[PDB]
Design a protein around this ligand. Structure first.
Ligand SMILES: [Fe+3]
Ligand SMILES: [Fe+3]
Ligand SMILES: [Fe+3]
Ligand SMILES: [Fe+3]
Lengths: 202, 238, 238, 202, 238, 202, 238, 202, 238
């Protein structure tokens, strides 16, 4: 048996090397971005945005963020999904983005995920898996984004309940807001200090 | 074969989040321990990237950005295999790389290093491993470069790489170095890794028999991702 | 002190003229043994080069040929001391160097290697050692390059150097390499040298404490020339 | 005690790196060449030319040649010269050149050297020390050029007489010729084979 | 997979042409160095031999020449695999062998050695490796024999073998010996090979588990030929 | 990675063990020989003959020779040939022979090969690859046979031009002769000494 | 010679700020990483102390405070050289020392250790190194003493020393111990230093040949400060 | 090359052994103190004072402080100063002091430093280099004291701008106050915790 | 620098007075222990010998006594440095030597050894070390010779030497031998010295690079005398 290749920080240019287009490096014709919504994608569109703060309360402007989620019916556009249900044919479920070099805000245009089966016949509340990469971060930090308008479901969510410090569970719940007609979920990530966001070893 | 969950990541084979030797990590490392969870479909699934989207020169960093001529530097080919911890090849995994040019300079206004920019070098590439987990790209050997950890800190030559395979749990980003580079022994970032054997796992080996005469040198570098265990009894994943 | 002749060159510390491993030597090596002679003024004398003739950038290969911008590649400083076999410093000796650019390409229409040319790099420099036999020049680390000995032969990165010191008997031309370069172990030219200790005598050592932050790396390389013996009895040189 | 730095071939570009000017590499303002004659230099001017052939009889077009000689009075422009005599103030005594990439001929414009003292009160016949560098030559090859019009002196020369094979002594004697008004000494160097030039370990 | 050229033959893993210890080589070895060339279709191609031409006993030296009875000597089976330097099996390669009989005598009026001739032994065989590069033939263990290098020179027992595979560049002829034979240590021919590890690469190993009871002993011997590199970028072969 | 099996001399009986039929050892029903011409083979028949001399100028009578060539259209009867052109179905392209125990002459009855593509869109002059095996030869000696009536093509041949000693290129050119009605190309191989045949490391 | 900046302090050759083994450090160590800066005149300059100010007995701790008689204890002489990391002697550097008396008691109302006070011992001295970086002072060998880290913690015998040399970057305060003292192996303070070789760098060696008969013993102790690199190209210090 | 002598804490008596006079140990006739102002010293006199707090917010009463600064014209009374300008002949530029065993306040009587040249033709805002020694501090802590009435200059200061966390830059700026007629700059040092003072590795 | 006394002679690095293995010592060795004394001016002072008195051939034993021709034997040059135990060179010290000729015969009617006398060899020389403590003389290599300790006792080849330097305390007489001489291992006189390292301290080393072609061989031999300690406090010498 072999050992996993050891992780290393993405470095100060991770948000540039993995998003060349946005760094004015036009090498690829087809570029990956933070827009998971295609014209025929099903589900209610939502905007997921926030900031990542260090131990001083300062937003990181060199962070690279990726999210993984299921479609509107809680099915993953993945061959590994064993639900026997058909997945939205117009949904990649994955997206990548960086933060604005100035403001520090990051965001994704996606769909609100449907409930996904949990272990032992349980049901997980709607969530989006998110990972953080950046200078100073030796191993990508895994976390989940739940939605505050899903209070009923979050209460019965297996992963949230596996966190024995009930007070930290809330750091994983994003807040719903409505800018005109668009639904926005604010999700701020605090890597260190008070209200430090919960991070998982998946 | 009914697959179960991915084997547990061995935290001892990876650098800790807090590594005072690497200064930037002091404020960007959680003070709380990582909460381990039993895996669900969310962790064992991952996106698929169709080969149709990839351009013909996406894995050729020597030509995918050459305008007037060729980039300046050492022509090198890098190939290897991506397997899971149990030896199984990882098929159609997205491997993305980025690096500096021959001067150790990255193509971005942020990098103010005096090392000269190369108008014919981009420093970005990507590929999908084949059915044997094999991957191959061509590039210019990146030059080492200074950075401020301690004023006179220098990164050995390296190429940053990222992988998205079959499971989100396999998501991994790292850096590989070149055999013989003396800066390898003094790097605070590489030294965040606990064991000497794991540090060496990030060193690409000179593959002399695969050098292409009067053209390019070659380095062999294999990557190992976490693997899934098979289930023969209860399948509680669902 | 009345100086006598230079100590005998130790043929065992040098490559033989005939080295079949290095093909070109097969037809350019005398079949007759070298005729050793007792030294005369002709052998113990040598020319003098006034510092007035040297330009301000003769020892700076990074700038002595830069036109529009800087050459592409690894900024490195190389320094060291030139002593005679008895430890005495060699003063005001002419040290001349020439090398390829970062691609392993030499600035000449003869070199048709696909490695890219650098419009801002010449590859030639020279200097005079000081009163302590000290020398220092700046350049771009040369890249290895293919050549035809066996079709897939590759020279490790190197810088060619020449010295004209106090005696014609000291005339010497050689090549030095960089610590850690894996091609060093496979080079037929370097292997023409009999002993392992002499081969290592041509390897410049990384001098980390002398790296210049956010600027250049540094290599330490000392050169040893033949030395003269002192005469305390008969002086038959004349 | 230290060992001498090991020699290595000058390589295929030695005649380019040590004569940049002639390879169209204008890095130096003052360049070294094959002209040892300055306007005020004393002695009779002469032209020394020839070719270097390999073991096949083919002229090397990538050879680098240097010569070291005394002035017209047999005194070396060197602090190591202990003759107590003054040296020609307008003579470097050293020169460097390559062969024509086409013809293969090399040459120097210099002065005919005066006799130099030999060991133990002896006298050496006029000569010029010459060294050969080139691809395939692991260690610079040392040799001497004597002049055929100095038969009387060459006969009593210590170095020439130290060569026990009297038949090889002639490979060190150049031939005088007169092109119009200029005196030329032809000196061909044969590295291998018949009439192989004598090489010294000095 | 688009194949490129064969990897360069490593001259150090082979005996030089000039080996004064083996006298006959003194006048049959070029004085000039071999000229290495970049490969073309001429070097990467080779003939094909259809199995239809091979007789049923071509690989059975015990019976392919037996007239009145069986040849005298040790019944041995020799098998092994033929792979290229990268581990790939060599399919349908022509393997031809020839040897002396149990007395060390070759079937030819030239061989005047007093060792007795065997009327029922020819000493010639041939076969084609299968899809796994596997080969197998049966024969009589050849006896050592004297020859004149130094009057009392003796060749250890050996079987001469030849191979024609996929590329002309792979053309190879050699000799293999039997484990334990003490003459192996004193053979000038075997000692023309530089390394000890390469010398041992020519020794067939006793394969006891594959002995056939009350019948024949068995030796295992693997052969490695040069391999081709794959091309993923420019294909200049044509 | 494995190392190539080390070469060894074919030995004093190589021309016997690999040509049993001609040594009166009738073990094989179908025997390999020096006749590459079949009744339906295309191209002009030619006879290739010569001798192999050692360093003393004496012909070897124990040498084993093999040749590899393309058909009349420059296509190799090999699956490795990637020209996309069809090959002469009645041509093996390979042949083997020894020298006459008395005279010392070796020969092959074959066809004159058509031009074969060289590297980088170039074109090679017609040639036949030949290898020499024999007692005293530790590694099969590779060489090529070109034809003198192909002067125009040989001049532009890549391999011939890779030989920097233009004087040695001729050792690879066979001479055309016509015995009555048959075309014969004389090709003598000199392993050592003057006019030593060029040998390749392919 | 135009001097550049001081070589980077090697953080690995020094104790970290946070060392839980040494309790007081837990609350007096920054949680943030030290910010490394490129040097300016502020860092490469330092004050000068004229010898005129120093008294005749400033470097003699045996007599500079003796009132009625001599202090009780072991008469020892301590000398050594102060060099920079490149071997250059540090000239006219202010070396100040302070220590406890033979009982391990410091002259101050704060020290309530039962070890007896010596009315004829002060425990303070200072000197300027000479042109060779040489320094020499005389004193009483300090006795070990208890302190509260863990109730039964004991400092091995030591002398505190401070240096102000040519550059503020060289400012250094430390402690040296005496060869053979067994408390050296158990000291939490000395163990804050990572490497064993650096710990030994703080041990004064018995210098028997320099003992003064019927008078005093002697210890040799050398100090190494950071050194400046010379500049031969751009001088950005200003 | 040698390694730097390893640092060690000054220990509980550092402020006593390096300031014997103030500990009633009269061994030296001439004692070093915290008064850098001599009668003929140029520049405006100022008083620099503050406290050093540990991670609990408690002032250290066993700390030893030293400062290094330039004269009123930004020139250091050091042979290492290469400005070619003359330095105030009545200024040592260095001073040392401890904290009051009771109050915990430390102070220096000095002059406000003039601007000093920075690297690459830049200009540094007026500052005073300060180092902290004490029990529990394994290596002297380096820091700088800037002045709040120099807002314009501090904004362009190279060192201050090298601190990427703009919020920490202020921990290096002392506050000007005026007690009657004397100018006082309050500078409190916080070794650990909130508003932790920035420390340099120079 | 105010000099104090010479460091104590280390009796363990010297042969004892009583050495029964060397018979003559049995009756010429005090039975009482040596009385050690503190040094005075009498012990730290010594005579001065002006170079004016020395002849041009005093250090050339090959010519200082040659009458009709040259002495028979091996032409050897012996040189080295005289330093004090602290590395300081001993300037203008009188070094006197005496030896036997090539037969092992001393020039005196007392020596009745059958080894032949050389009419052109004296066997006596002397010199003054220079400012670097350097000395050099030429002679004939002395031959070993029999003596009666045990009837068949043989002294290895040796040269007796004496030194008068700066202090009477440094007065020393000894013998040095030549590297490789097998009699060295069996000599009772040399074995009076306790340690093996001190015995080797008396062996002159072949200095091949300093051989003079077609003339003489050379041996390197360094001598170490006791050194003075410097005084920085009380100076009780007076
Ligand atoms: Fe990087
Ligand atoms: Fe080169
Ligand atoms: Fe055989
Ligand atoms: Fe203490």
């Amino acid at each position: 048996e072999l050992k996993e290749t050891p992780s290393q920080t993405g470095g100060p240019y991770v948000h540039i090397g993995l998003l060349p287009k946005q760094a004015n490096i036009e090498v690829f014709e087809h570029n990956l971005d933070n827009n998971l919504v295609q014209d025929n994608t099903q589900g209610q569109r939502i905007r997921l945005e926030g900031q990542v703060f260090d131990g001083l309360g300062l937003p990181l402007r060199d962070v690279l963020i990726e999210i993984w989620q299921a479609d509107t019916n809680g099915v993953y556009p993945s061959q590994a999904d064993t639900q026997g249900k058909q997945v939205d044919p117009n949904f990649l479920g994955w997206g990548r983005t960086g933060a604005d070099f100035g403001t520090g805000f990051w965001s994704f245009n996606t769909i609100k995920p449907g409930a996904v089966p949990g272990r032992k016949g349980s049901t997980q509340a709607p969530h989006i898996s998110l990972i953080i990469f950046a200078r100073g971060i030796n191993i990508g930090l895994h976390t989940r984004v739940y939605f505050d308008d899903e209070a009923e479901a979050n209460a019965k969510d297996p992963v949230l309940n596996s966190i024995e410090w009930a007070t930290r569970r809330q750091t994983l719940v994003a807040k719903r807001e409505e800018r005109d007609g668009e639904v926005v979920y604010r999700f701020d990530i605090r890597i260190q200090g008070e209200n430090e966001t919960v991070f998982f070893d998946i | 074969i009914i697959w179960g969950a991915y084997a547990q990541r061995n935290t001892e084979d990876h650098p800790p989040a807090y590594a005072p030797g690497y200064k930037t990590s002091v404020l960007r490392s959680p003070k709380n321990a990582l909460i381990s969870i039993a895996e669900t479909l969310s962790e064992v699934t991952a996106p698929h990237f169709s080969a149709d989207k990839f351009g013909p020169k996406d894995n050729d960093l020597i030509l995918n950005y050459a305008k007037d001529g060729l980039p300046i530097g050492e022509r090198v080919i890098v190939h290897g295999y991506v397997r899971d911890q149990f030896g199984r090849p990882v098929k159609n995994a997205l491997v993305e790389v980025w690096q500096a040019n021959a001067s150790g300079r990255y193509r971005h206004p942020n990098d103010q290093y005096i090392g000269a920019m190369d108008p014919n070098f981009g420093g970005c590439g990507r590929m999908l491993t084949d059915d044997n987990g094999y991957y191959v790209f061509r590039t210019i050997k990146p030059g080492p470069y200074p950075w401020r950890n301690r004023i006179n800190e220098w990164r050995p030559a390296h190429i940053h790489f990222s992988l998205i395979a079959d499971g989100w749990a396999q998501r991994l980003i790292s850096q590989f170095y070149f055999e013989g580079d003396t800066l390898i022994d003094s790097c605070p970032i590489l030294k965040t890794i606990p064991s000497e054997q794991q540090r060496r796992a990030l060193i690409a080996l000179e593959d002399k028999s695969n050098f292409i005469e009067a053209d390019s040198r070659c380095y062999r570098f294999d990557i190992t991702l976490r693997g899934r265990r098979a289930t023969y009894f209860e399948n509680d994943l669902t």
